Design a binder for this molecule. Structure first.
Ligand code: JKW
Lengths: 269, 8
């Protein structure tokens, strides 16, 4: 209010404004969420009733990571306001892929590794993001670091079946499409396979339900056999046939990853 | 096929 200098609207991008924290000129994003539009609510450690998004953001925002950090939040009469970290300079991964086309595998490896580490961090914090996609990934173009955003479709991580989902349908697995259910981890691995294909091919593999359930991955771009193999494994139709995060990260295609700064110097600067 | 965003 007096704490923040409010700049322009960032980015059908909800209501997120550029901001500067007054105390120390920190770049922030100021995200407004209408109470009437929130379906999932939770309670904080002290029983303050808040949107689930706030609960999940607090759980992941302790320490450094590839997750955007919630710095503060406020309740207003008809909304919640969320103060989030803002890297600068930044571009989201969707626009990056649109402008550059299919990524070199070296770059895709670095990015994909970082998303994997970020999603492991969420899972270690008891959080399932449920909307892993290029649009929800920011690239810090100077540091070469990726940041996961928008926990508005997320849930507490659990080992039992999920029967609700409001993420992005084209990144959702066939068990969701066909049966209206999924397990968190295996569904996340499906969406990571869609993302990896998107990176190395320049667009997602499936647009329609029939393609999602079909179990057929055609490569439009030149992609190494090892990368093709990892993608097809992540997109196994049967959830139990998909790799664990450990198996992904030990896959031959994932060896010799660049550091974020190396990535920035080679591909972004 | 146009590359497009997809809402949640
Ligand atoms: C597809 N979704 C729709 C809802 C959107 C808004 N919902 C969101 N939920 C979040 O937690 C957010 C956090 C956050 C922190 S910094 C930042 C940012 C900075 C610059 C941008 O502009 C660019 F890239 F051009 F520089 C765009 C975004 N966003 S944004 C996010 C994307």
């Amino acid at each position: 209010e007096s704490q923040y200098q409010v700049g322009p609207l960032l980015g059908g991008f909800g209501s997120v404004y550029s901001g500067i924290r007054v105390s120390d000129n920190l770049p922030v994003a100021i995200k407004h969420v209408e109470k009437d539009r929130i379906s999932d609510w939770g309670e904080l450690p002290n029983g303050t009733r808040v949107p689930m998004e706030v609960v999940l953001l607090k759980k992941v925002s302790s320490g450094f990571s590839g997750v955007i950090r919630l710095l503060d939040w406020f309740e207003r009469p008809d909304s919640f306001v969320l103060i989030l970290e803002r890297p600068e300079p930044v571009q989201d991964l969707f626009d990056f892929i649109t402008e550059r086309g299919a990524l070199q595998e070296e770059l895709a490896r670095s990015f994909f590794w970082q998303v994997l580490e970020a999603v492991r961090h969420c899972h270690n914090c008891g959080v399932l993001h449920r909307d892993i996609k290029d649009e929800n990934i920011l690239i810090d173009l100077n540091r070469g670091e990726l940041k996961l955003i928008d926990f508005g479709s997320g849930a507490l991580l659990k080992d039992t079946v999920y029967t609700d989902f409001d993420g992005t349908r084209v990144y959702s697995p066939p068990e969701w499409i066909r049966y209206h259910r999924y397990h968190g981890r295996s569904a996340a691995v499906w969406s990571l396979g869609i993302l990896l294909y998107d990176m190395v091919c320049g667009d997602i593999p499936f647009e329609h339900d029939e393609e999602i359930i079909g179990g057929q991955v055609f490569f439009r771009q030149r992609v190494s056999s090892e990368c093709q193999h990892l993608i097809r494994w992540c997109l196994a139709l049967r959830p139990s046939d998909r790799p664990t995060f450990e198996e992904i990260q030990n896959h031959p295609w994932m060896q010799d990853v660049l550091l974020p700064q190396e990535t920035a110097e080679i591909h972004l600067h | 096929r146009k590359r497009r965003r997809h809402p949640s």
